[PDB]
Each structure stands twice: as structure tokens, then as C-alpha cells.
Amino acid sequence: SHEQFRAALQLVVDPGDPRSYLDNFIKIGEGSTGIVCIATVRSSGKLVAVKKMDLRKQQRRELLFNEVVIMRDYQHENVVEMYNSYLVGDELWVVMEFLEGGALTDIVTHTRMNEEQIAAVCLAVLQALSVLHAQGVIHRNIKSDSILLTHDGRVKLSDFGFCAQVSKEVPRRKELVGTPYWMAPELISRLPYGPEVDIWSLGIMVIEMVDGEPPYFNEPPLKAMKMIRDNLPPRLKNLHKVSPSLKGFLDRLLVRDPAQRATAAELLKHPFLAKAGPPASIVPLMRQNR
């Protein structure tokens, strides 16, 4: 079935091999689906990013088409740009925008964001999601690792490898997909679910930005899932430090019943987001400036 699956991808990717125009591949990170490198475009000296995914090593091979569906149809300015895809041996390579400021993860684990900064991240994420959700796309992997920055503090949504579509014909999804600590309780419970799962996962990312880590992070993933499934919504460890406006915002995200949870469109009008600073306000958080 692997040689079968390569042949299918071949019909959907761009022809050729980007090794013919890229130099100096350097691995800068990874996920479960594969690795991410920086590369230099030989003729110009421009930097790009390259995601490499081994076809043999996927939980669910069929998700790899997500990368092609989003790249073909669902582009926006708070979303990382995908340029080309190739089949290189047994790997799918995706050549994409290089976000040189790195991932929000490096920030939330090494410094404290203030609320102007938190609100700017949430605004940017929510702008991306309102548009995605309007077109039936659920990201399903919202967390700090999926949010990338430029050198000038602009915020983009990345890693659509786990996304799915919904429609009049297919209004809810059923698959168990995401990162344990960030999964919505309805998704852990295997209830059919929609875009609302991204809003819950966003709330967990707000807890990352306040506390440094998602709830139950000190537990094995399976156990954390049970606790999310069965308990009241998790609390901030640093609850005392946050403003009533941040807490009111967070209470609209971390609502167990998905029909009571706010939508991205609604959230863009919340007063908490009035505190959002410009991209400039994010710049000092980055490793290269700290």
C-alpha cells in the first residue's frame, strides 16, 4: 500500500525536485508528521522553510492531502504561505514561508507575556480562525507550537496537517485528532464536533501564555485526556495575576458545552482584545532580543 500511496501523491504535487534550486538544508525543528528545515534559494540567497514528511511514518497517511487542500484553496495573511509541494523519494516536501522569529512555544517557555502581547496573539489567531471556520476548515491542532512569528512580531497560523473540512453535507467530524493536553472535551468524548474545538484549544493556549504550560502537563497524555473529559474546565495556576478582562475572555473559550462556547466571530468583539498591541510589541519576546 505504500507504493500505491506514493503514486497518488505524485498526481497532486508539483513535478521535480527542489534540491535543484535549494542549498544548505538545516533542520530547525520537528513534529510527529516530520521535520522542518531552512534552506537557501541558490539564485537569490532568499531563505525558505521546507517540511519533510516520510510517507511510511504517518499515524494517518490520508491527512497528508490536507497540506495540498489548504495550499490550493485556503490562503490568508495570518496563515503561513505554502509555495510548492514535491514528492522526493518516500517523502512529501512542502516548501513554505520561513517564519524566522520562530514559534510561540519558545516564548511561553522562557518569558512572561503581558496582556497586551497575549491579546495581540489572540487577535491574530482569531482573525485567521474566523475566516477558516467560515469556509468549513477546522485546524484541530491549535497550540503554541503551531503559531509562528516573523522577525518584526507578526503572528501566523501554521501546521495544517491535522485539519478537516465540514459542510452542509458533512456538518461534524468524528476523528480523534490533536495534541492530548489541548484537545476539546467533546472531541475526547468522541461526540461529533465542529470548529468549536479550535476555540477550546485556543483557550488552552491562553493558559500556556499565562502559566507556561497547558493544564495537567505533568500527567501522562492518556490520563490528562480523562481529566479534561471528566472535570470542570481547567483553571489558570496564575489566576491571581490576570485581569478581570482576560479571565472573562478565557471563560468564553473554556466552556465545556460546545454550543455555549463563543465562536471566533463573536470573540473578535470581546473587550479583552482592545488591549492588543501591534506586532512591534511582540518583538522583544523573541530569543534573539531577550
Partner: peptide, 6 residues
């Protein structure tokens, strides 16, 4: 403390 997907 695993950040990997499922």
C-alpha cells in the same frame, strides 16, 4: 509532558 500529536 509530550507535545506530540495523536
Amino acid at each position: 509532558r509530550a507535545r506530540y500529536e495523536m
